[PDB]
Design a protein around this ligand. Structure first.
Ligand SMILES: c1cc(C2=NCCCN2)ccc1OCCCCCOc1ccc(C2=NCCCN2)cc1
Ligand SMILES: c1cc(C2=NCCCN2)ccc1OCCCCCOc1ccc(C2=NCCCN2)cc1
Ligand SMILES: [Ca+2]
Ligand SMILES: [Ca+2]
Ligand SMILES: [Ca+2]
Ligand SMILES: [Ca+2]
Lengths: 91, 91
């Protein structure tokens, strides 16, 4: 598999590594999202320590108002993070 | 770096590995897009052999009508491919 194919698989893997811990196994609730950010984005994002901070990230990500981040919404999060990295974390 | 952080970097790397070959260094023209699909998605997508086929993919991807795939448009392509992989290539 190419690096791109392995990358695609990695996105799926990390989603399900966190989404399946609690409740809906196919969605990240705020507690799961907090863990993913703190454990898997510790180099790209500042650690979330306050509930207000994860509430704010979930508000941004949750496009269908169910209070959780589904796979499609996670892809949008990945695009946000990748765009930030691409622009050398300038904004 | 986590597997997710490395994945994010891989997406950027493959884009620029193809986008910088011809013309606009920051966009994939159809010829570059064809090469990326054939070389880096050979396990997830059928090889493109006909110009009609890459025209059709570019039409789907090109949301601003410039005939090329920019970084934002490539992210949407990545989301499409990842969603397909996620659903076990069922659709
Ligand atoms: C790879 C390719 C390109 C690229 N290539 C082709 C041309 C275009 N781009 C650009 C960047 C790339 O990244 C390599 C990974 C380096 C680790 C970054 O680590 C951080 C994380 C967070 C910050 C930060 N956090 C918040 C406030 C600002 N700062 C800073 C640094
Ligand atoms: C990883 C995780 C999940 C997952 N996990 C948590 C639950 C949810 N999902 C799902 C899939 C994953 O993928 C692993 C990579 C296997 C190689 C697939 O290789 C192909 C490529 C193209 C085809 C095809 N092409 C076009 C017509 C149909 N067929 C078939 C097979
Ligand atoms: Ca869950
Ligand atoms: Ca949601
Ligand atoms: Ca180009
Ligand atoms: Ca375009």
């Amino acid at each position: 598999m190419s690096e791109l194919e392995k990358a695609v698989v990695a996105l799926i893997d990390v989603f399900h590594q966190y989404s399946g811990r609690e409740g809906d196994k196919h969605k990240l609730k705020k507690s799961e999202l907090k863990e993913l950010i703190n454990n898997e984005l510790s180099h790209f994002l500042e650690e979330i320590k306050e509930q207000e901070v994860v509430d704010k990230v979930m508000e941004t990500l949750d496009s269908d108002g169910d209070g959780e981040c589904d796979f499609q919404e996670f892809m949008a999060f990945v695009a946000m993070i990748t765009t930030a990295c691409h622009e050398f974390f300038e904004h």
